[PDB]
Design a protein around this ligand. Sequence first.
Ligand SMILES: [Cl-]
Ligand SMILES: [Cl-]
Length: 320
Amino acid sequence: DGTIYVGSNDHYLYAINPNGKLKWKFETGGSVHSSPAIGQDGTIYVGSNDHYLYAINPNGKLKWKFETGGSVHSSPAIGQDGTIYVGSNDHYLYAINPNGKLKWKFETGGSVHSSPAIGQDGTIYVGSNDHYLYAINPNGKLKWKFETGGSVHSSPAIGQDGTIYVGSNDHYLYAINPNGKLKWKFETGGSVHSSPAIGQDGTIYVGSNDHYLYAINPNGKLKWKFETGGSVHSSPAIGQDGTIYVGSNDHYLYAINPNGKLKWKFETGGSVHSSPAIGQDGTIYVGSNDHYLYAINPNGKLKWKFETGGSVHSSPAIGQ
Ligand SMILES: [Cl-]
Ligand SMILES: [Cl-]
């Protein structure tokens, strides 16, 4: 099918066809910064600034909405049994059943902006504003928490071997072993809000507020760093040939070769905080602060752009 879903600061969740024409839009009560996740049956889940986690049917009609105590900026993750996990600015990590009833909630010490990741054994990992990376068991009990030096707004990535990687506002990219002990930390020049991505050879890519996209080896030593013109808050995506795509606050979507050299850059009208998604055909989709969702071909030329009513900070998801 190939529908592209993305939130906008104009309060809507958009469903766009691969040709750039609207399928439907669903109005929430507030800005949709959260990035949608798609369940096995096609349900689209997304948080809103209006405090709700939404479940929207493929036809664009509400399935249910679950009210948390504060804005849902965190992006949901879906477990093997269908449980939907999402953080809230009310300080909790929520686990919601597919029917929209609470499974459990776990209180952290601060707002949960970070988006959860799920391990192979069902462990749920998420950062908190309280400076910790949390590992929560499927039953909602704490497994462990790891203290960084600052707020963990970056969303964790899990390696093949179980290593958990996450940025911190203390400027480091952390690699944490499955037991919750530090493996290594890599110092960038500024806060690491960007969420890491792991390449096929284990290279970890992450943006930094210091304007660079970093490639770090599994041993925690620098592979390369590529300088953009502004802070890299967007989270990288990796194509089949190894190309790394990431937005920058300098307004460009970047395509970087595995060797750290520029492949191409595409200029949007505003900062690219949204994190790119790659379609089956290689199309790269990303939002911009200029209000558009962009579809860029593998050669870096514009396929189409779709104007929403406000900034597109949400990161797109592509349906089957
Ligand atoms: Cl159409
Ligand atoms: Cl974000």
